[PDB]
């Protein structure tokens, strides 16, 4: 009954920023961490980090510490992933997940233009 | 960080037989008597689907044809029997130590 609905695909320009969203239904997001993952066909699946929506506390993988910002709003049961200063290697599918890591969103495609 | 290495990278298995996929961790993923290794299935254009958590627990909604084994650094996913719908890429993931890390994937085909 839990659904994680991610925002639509985005074409982004190098040097720009983009903010992705993950709207959760059927689950109180204060009840668990929300995790963000990145997937590229060659470099595979990477864990970006997790946020605790109950207190705002964040933990990032070191390679994402000055690229990604995770936020959340219990008021709207929505988590956000802001990607800054976009570059070619940021083009990827981004996933959110919760309930441990059992339930995943459908993914958001970020493409970066030349 | 923990590095996960899967073997083989790809395999083709005859319909109805057994298959095993291996995931080896560069450091232990055990803590307090549990092993924090997950297995995911992914098909093209879809999100990874959790199959097994904490090495050997079958996720709700997943067929019992899937099972997980192992501890420490060595883990395996067994499919028994393999069916047509199992054609997919399989990933292991450890959640014992930050950052969580994933194996490179094993693509399973049916023949």
């Amino acid at each position: 009954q839990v659904q994680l609905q991610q925002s639509g695909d985005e074409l982004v320009k190098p040097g720009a920023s983009v903010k992705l969203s993950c709207t959760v239904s059927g689950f109180n997001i204060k009840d668990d961490f929300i995790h963000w993952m990145k997937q590229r066909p060659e470099q595979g699946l990477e864990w970006i980090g997790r946020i605790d929506p109950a207190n705002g506390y964040t933990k990032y993988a070191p390679k994402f510490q000055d690229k990604a910002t995770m936020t959340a709003d219990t008021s709207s049961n929505t988590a956000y992933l802001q990607l800054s200063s976009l570059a070619s290697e940021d083009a990827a599918v981004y996933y959110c997940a919760t309930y441990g890591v059992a339930y995943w969103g459908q993914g958001t495609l970020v493409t970066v233009s030349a | 960080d923990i590095v996960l290495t899967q073997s083989p990278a790809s395999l083709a298995v005859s319909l109805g037989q057994r298959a095993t996929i291996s995931c080896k961790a560069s450091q232990s993923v055990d803590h307090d008597g549990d092993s924090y290794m997950n297995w995911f299935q992914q098909k093209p254009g879809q999100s990874p689907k959790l199959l097994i958590y904490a090495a050997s627990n079958l996720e709700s909604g997943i067929p019992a044809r899937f099972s997980g084994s192992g501890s420490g650094t060595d883990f395996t996913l067994n499919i028994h029997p393999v069916e047509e719908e199992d054609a997919a890429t399989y990933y292991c993931q450890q959640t014992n130590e930050d950052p969580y890390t994933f194996g490179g994937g094993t693509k399973l085909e049916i023949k």
């Binding site: 668990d32 961490f33 309930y99 441990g100 890591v101 059992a102 | 803590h31 549990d34 924090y36 997950n38 959790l50 958590y53 904490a54 627990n57 996720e59 709700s60 959640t95 014992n96 130590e97 969580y100």
Partner: peptide
């Protein structure tokens, strides 16, 4: 139930 053990909760 994967909530408790699909990540390590410490």
């Amino acid at each position: 139930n994967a909530y408790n053990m699909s990540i390590r909760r410490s």
